[PDB]
Swiss-Prot record:
It comes from the Eukaryota. This is Dihydrolipoyllysine-residue acetyltransferase component of pyruvate dehydrogenase complex, mitochondrial. It is linked to Primary biliary cirrhosis is a chronic, progressive cholestatic liver disease characterized by the presence of antimitochondrial autoantibodies in patients' serum. It manifests with inflammatory obliteration of intra-hepatic bile duct, leading to liver cell damage and cirrhosis. Patients with primary biliary cirrhosis show autoantibodies against the E2 component of pyruvate dehydrogenase complex. The chain holds residues 92 to 186 of 647 of the full protein. It comes from Homo sapiens. Part of the pyruvate dehydrogenase complex (PDHc) that is a multi-enzyme complex composed of multiple copies of three enzymes, pyruvate dehydrogenase (subunits PDH1A and PDHB, E1 component), dihydrolipoamide acetyltransferase (DLAT, E2 component), and dihydrolipoamide dehydrogenase (DLD, E3 component) to which is added an additional protein the E3-binding protein (PDHX, E3BP). In terms of structural architecture, the E2 and E3BP components assemble into a 60meric central core with icosahedral symmetry. The central core is decorated with E1 and E3 proteins. The gene is DLAT.
Length: 108
């Protein structure tokens, strides 16, 4: 078809039972920062408390769609992206979900 960008979207995983939405406490890691399985990727604030999202494996921060502090973060809402190499990060440095918006959440 078309082999261009090869990244991985990270859908805000429900770190709770009745978790409907969370808040990106902090991005323990940054863009271009190497991540290792277990290494804290970021913290999420839930009615329960501030949870810690661990990595699923080795990789690097592709893009951080949702920054830290973003409140009202729904479950599944890509929080960040991951790649297999840093040489791709750069390419992902300038990534946008469907280039189309005015001011705020639009989602065409």
């Amino acid at each position: 078809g078309s082999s261009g960008s090869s990244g991985q979207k990270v859908p805000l995983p429900s770190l709770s039972p009745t978790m409907q939405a969370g808040t990106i406490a902090r991005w323990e890691k940054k863009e271009g920062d190497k991540i290792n399985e277990g290494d804290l990727i970021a913290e999420v604030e839930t009615d329960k408390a501030t949870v810690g999202f661990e990595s699923l494996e080795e990789c690097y921060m592709a893009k951080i769609l949702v920054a830290e502090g973003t409140r009202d973060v729904p479950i599944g809402a890509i929080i960040c992206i991951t790649v297999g190499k840093p040489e791709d990060i750069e390419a992902f440095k300038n990534y946008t979900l469907d280039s189309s918006a005015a001011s705020g959440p639009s989602s065409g």
